[model samples]
Target: VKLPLPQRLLHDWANGSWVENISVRPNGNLLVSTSTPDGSVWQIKEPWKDQPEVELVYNFDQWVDRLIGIGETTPDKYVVVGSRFYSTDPMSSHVDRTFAAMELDFSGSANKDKPAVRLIAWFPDAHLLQGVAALPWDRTKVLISDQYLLRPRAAPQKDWTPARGQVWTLDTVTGAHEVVFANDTALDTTYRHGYDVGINGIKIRRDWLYWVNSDDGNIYRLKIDKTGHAVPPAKPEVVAFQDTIWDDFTFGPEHEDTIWATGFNAIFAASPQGKVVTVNGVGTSDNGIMPGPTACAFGRSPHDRNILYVTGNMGEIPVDIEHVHLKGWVRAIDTTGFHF
Candidate 1:
């Protein structure tokens, strides 16, 4: 089959928060990120608001790295996930700067001249909380992960080791963060990069928590009100687990019942069993133009599945985020009609 080169340069984004999720605000505005250093978001609008109409909106000055679309936990308020931490130099044994800790907070402002940003609360610090999933069951609270500490030499593992794995549940209304799961591993906190042992994304369906790991390559499920959450009783069941890869993931925002995970190549969607049911942009991998699918989001569209809205490369390779296949580019599959 003759397939064109896979690398389709879509957006002209280069500097800013690595393509996070493409989400619409409660007030109905679009949001995008590339991470700090490039800290800030672009409000994807129907008319592309005036440059002055656009603002950094938020900044960690310390270099924010991750973000997710969101609304306020409080009335007349808002919330978001901005990973604030720096590893300084990967070669150093001692720590440099611990920028983010217990992330996922409500950052807004009542100020008159500020960028309309404010730090509301620190999230589950026991873990490196990355992208957030506000509870559909309860908007008052949200879930986040303890991805891993990026401190060259900090604790819970002061050796700058990789986090074994720990995801937490927090009360957005009260900042009551508690450990929901922890995968104790040989992968110390000082060993791996950020997002290593963190639960990249989470979805709350029914009373069960659907989660994917950035390090262990496993998709897991556990009752929201479990007995052993603080100390999992066994190997996190291999519902649809991969191996050491399969990093960040998200449930089909527009689709409602499935998920899309971006590994090295394929943008995969499957049942809870790790089955390769179907891949978006079929033959995309065959094209060699790997669309480093990083983070994602959906719109009101009910037709073609809006799969890859914001694409990004691995953090090690010039980590430039762009060429996204947002809105009209990707197809949105209707899971409601798919017969399996």
Candidate 2:
């Protein structure tokens, strides 16, 4: 069937807030991580109510990027990525420059002594891990995407063509990881991207996995072999392409091949083939479409199972930084109108 227009959901109580990543708890509560005011995690309970309540579940000393809800393990936990890139001076040796991931059991409240936080992985500053996807093969094993395909152009010159620009299999329990796919073209960043983020959004189906190359605006699908390695490791087949920068995506909660993506200013659905279809418009403003719609997730609320929630900005440039600043918010649309 054809897709429908985007329906407006809830907006943040505060304007210009940076809602980075979102994940819905098993209990139907929605959790969002924001980079505004240092960093924080917010929760929405009974979100269908006119005045759906929002609460600050946790605050971070550094900016937070990705938040994943892990359900394979009992007593589910959340995976939080500590984004310290700009958390401190880029050049200061004193900068709190450690790159790491934390696993938290949110079953407790922030006031009752901090949530149990465990450092699962840490890497040198050279690697910029930006996105993650859980593997069904094992509960503790997941895929991690490093943002850049090459060392920073400003960094020391060296053979920068080995295992970069690919997703690695990370064992959260063992702290050991390896590139499941090496030097994959699908993971390479575009020359247009100054900061070097390549493959950004990702998710996994039963035996197949999908990811997006934000730079070139293509989504690739990899079928996992019986051996558990990505088939054609270096070249996954393309599932879709919009030729527009895409931030993140997930398969439809109720459909198989219908995947939802953050298409710059609007939400787009990519069919099992490479066809691109807009699920919604850019925005209400005369500007046509808003910019910087980052990530999205399906709702866990009983009344909103068909809703797709998104977070982003109009565009965050230096001159107009505040334009989408506190204004960055989470938006939702009824995806029930879409079918593959």
Candidate 3:
């Protein structure tokens, strides 16, 4: 069947806010976290059906960017969000700098003043607050990576490349935060990124946790015996060790993102044996479509079951909130399926 219309719909997602990361609810509802204008979590009421808008859950004060939802352990429909301000000077404007968590039954109606949004935590200063991955079990601890790196050596030197990478852990209930990975040497190596120290994305699975070094286009995995503990040298294996996985500014929006690591260009799915495969570009620019991918789903759909979602950098230059972000799409893909 054909994909949904305005598939590449653009919402003035952040009327004044600049949207960074987005995740879809189980019931097909859309949830997005933005910065500036209104740094909070916003939801689509009817979605694609001219539904009313609602703040549902958000933290208007702090600058919230790149928010993802974690499934709850019980029936609360609970979720955890990751946020941080990284605009060269995260501290210049304290209110613009923050990290937090929120709760929502994503599948139901909009409730802007739900108070579900609690100030779980935040970072006062940082070049960029990026890399947010939810715990597999429930809303306990979410793994995050503060990008101090960049790619494509260009005009915006600071934005394209950062100093190094920082990994942090946040407690959804306590708001307790700490740096888990301290070794900066991991970013060393020949990498072609927006700048340098190309560490971008982070994730957790059972005893194993993974992170992607976008510059070199490599995936690193290590065993985490404890949380908020020292991140010893990741044995350092390549998740997508293919030669074709190129990382660049194919996506145009979020050029002003802190740490300059708006969202990873793409991700590499692997097997238990550490075998490498092709990296899937799920975002708008890489989707290979004229207009780009639609409100897509990866890791779920049969055709694309490995990549989850790709928020594009399309639409207006400065970005708006009234129309669709014209961002990108998501794909439910199979790791092994995207084989070379």
Which numbered prediction scores highest in lDDT against the true structure? Answer: 2
Across 1-340, the per-residue lDDT of candidate 1 in tens digits comes to 1222122333445332245444444433345544433445555432122221333455544434444333334332345555444432221222233223222232355432232455546542444445455566566666665555444343233444454556566665456667656654422233233334456656566666666665556677666553224333434445675543455566665545566666644456656556744344334444333444555444433332442343553322233222323221111222333322
Could you tell me how far off, in angstroms, the CA of residue 123 lies in candidate 2 after the best superposition? 1.8
lDDT of every predicted structure (CA atoms): 0.45, 0.61, 0.42
Candidates in descending TM-score order: 2, 1, 3
When 1 and 2 are scored with TM-score, the better candidate is 2
Query: 300, model 2: CA deviation in Å?
Result: 2.0
Tens digits of per-residue lDDT for model 3 on 1-340? Answer: 1111122332444223344455445444445554434355555433433333444465544435445333232233444454443331211222234445555443234533242444555565433445456566554666666554333222233333244667777776576777777555454434453233355545555566666565565556667755634445545555444332222111111121111112233333344454532244334334433122212222222332222343433333322212333432222222232222
Candidate 1's displacement at residue 321, Å, is 15
Better of 2 and 3 by lDDT: 2
lDDT of 2 by residue, 231-257 (tens): 653358888888767778887766466
Q: What is the lDDT for 131 in model 1?
A: 49
Per-model root-mean-square deviation over C-alphas: 7.0, 4.9, 8.9
Error of 3 at 261 (Å): 15
Pairs in clash, predicted candidate 2 = 15-326, 15-327, 16-325, 16-326, 16-327, 17-326
Model 2: worst 10 consecutive residues (lDDT sum): 87-96
